[PDB]
Every structure is written in C-alpha cells, then in structure tokens.
Design a protein around this ligand. Structure first.
Ligand SMILES: Nc1nc2c(ncn2[C@@H]2O[C@H](COP(=O)(O)OP(=O)(O)OP(=O)(O)O)[C@@H](O)[C@H]2O)c(=O)[nH]1
Ligand SMILES: [Mg+2]
Ligand SMILES: [Zn+2]
Lengths: 168, 34
C-alpha cells in the first residue's frame, strides 16, 4: 500500500454544478439551494485503487467571469482538473472548451483533465449531445462522463477515472 | 479560518478580498518579489 496526493481544480461557468459535484464526492451530499461560490473553496477526499490511496486536494473555484483572473492561482501546480458544463446549456459547453484551452496553454504539462457534462438527470432538456462532447474529449485526451451531482450518477466514477490516469 | 473565500492556495491564508489576495500572493509567493 501507499498514499499519493494530488492537487485537483474544478473550473467552469457559474451554476453548472461544480460545488454540487464536489459536495457529492466529498460528503455524499447535494443542496438544491447551493450558494454561488465566492473566490474558491478547499475540500479533500480519497479513492483507493490498485493498492494505492489517492488523496485529492480540491480547489472548487467561483465560475463567475469576474473571478477569471484568480483561476490561474488555483490551477498553478494542479495535477488534475475537472472542467464542468451543464448538459442543458450549450453555451456552458462553449465556455468549458475555453477552460480546456486555457489549461492546455497555461497549466502544468502533465495535467490530467476530466470533462463533466453535469445535470445529466435533466436529460429531457438536453442541449449538448453526448457524442459531440465525447468527440471533443477523445480528440483532446480528456476523461469525459456525464454526471449528476443531484442523483450521484457518475460522481465517484469520474474521480476514480482521474485517479487511474494519474501517475502513481 | 473559512474553507471558502479568497484563500491563498500556498499558505491557506484567508484574505478579505480578491485584491488583498493578489497583493498577498505577489508579496510572499512570487519569485522573490514583484
Ligand atoms: N438538476 C440538477 N441540478 C444541479 C445539479 N448540480 C448542481 N445543480 C444545481 O445547480 C445550481 C448551481 O449549482 P452549484 O454547485 O452551486 O454551481 P457552481 O458551478 O458551483 O456555481 P458557481 O459557484 O457560481 O461557479 C444549484 O441549484 C444546484 O443545486 C445536477 O446535477 N442536477
Ligand atoms: Mg460553486
Ligand atoms: Zn499565501
């Protein structure tokens, strides 16, 4: 057995569900009335795989554009990121691609990036097709899953996928 | 010390505003100074 620590950053447009995703993963909780994040929140949680305890130090950033220039302070030295969009919001997916780009240009060369298509419980209001997002993920070596912080769908799974990919 | 706000990711110092955070970071964590 052994313990590996990694800094992980959550990025994406306001209200896509970043704080909900991480609350689900960390606490097994979800709030319908979750408050918009001011600045950034710190959280931590572990997964275990292949005898290895993988400990995430998580920075949950405020998505509001006014906080854009603070983001690089939080993804400095981050070994993983989750860029989150809202499947019911195609524009949130456009903003997600621009976060992925910024990460490619400005983050550590080793960063493992996951893409979350969140609020997938609202699939009857889907605006972003699964295969479009998958194609974008595949083309950029991103780990992509549709998640729902509300139901818990694929929440643990996305963090486990990151852990697998990280150098251990 | 709140787990949310304008926290410095380097020393976990909680600052009162974004500007105070940028100020703090540049004075203590950037390349000696600037
Ligand atoms: N139906 C549904 N609602 C969700 C889901 N995830 C988050 N929400 C809701 O969407 C709203 C915004 O969620 P947040 O977690 O606060 O979004 P955020 O990305 O952290 O927003 P900022 O902190 O402003 O950047 C809240 O009402 C959440 O309860 C989801 O998976 N399904
Ligand atoms: Mg938030
Ligand atoms: Zn500091």
């Amino acid at each position: 057995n052994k313990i590996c620590q990694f800094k992980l950053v959550l990025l994406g447009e306001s209200a896509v569900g970043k704080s909900s995703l991480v609350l689900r993963f960390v606490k097994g909780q979800f709030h319908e009335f979750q408050e918009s994040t001011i600045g950034a929140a710190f959280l931590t949680q572990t997964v275990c795989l292949d005898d290895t305890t993988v400990k995430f130090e998580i920075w949950d950033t405020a998505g509001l554009e006014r906080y854009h220039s603070l983001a690089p302070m939080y993804y400095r030295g981050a070994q993983a990121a989750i860029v989150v969009y809202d499947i019911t919001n195609e524009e949130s997916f456009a903003r997600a691609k621009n976060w992925v780009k910024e990460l490619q240009r400005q983050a550590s060369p080793n960063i493992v990036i996951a893409l979350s298509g969140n609020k997938a419980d609202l699939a009857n209001k889907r605006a972003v097709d699964f295969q479009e997002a998958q194609s974008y993920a595949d083309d950029n070596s991103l780990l992509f899953m549709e998640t729902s912080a509300k139901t818990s769908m694929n929440v643990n799974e996305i963090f486990m996928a990151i852990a697998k990919k990280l150098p251990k | 010390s709140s787990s949310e706000g304008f926290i410095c990711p380097q020393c976990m110092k909680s600052l009162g505003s974004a500007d105070e955070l940028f100020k703090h970071y540049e004075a203590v964590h950037d390349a000696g100074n600037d």
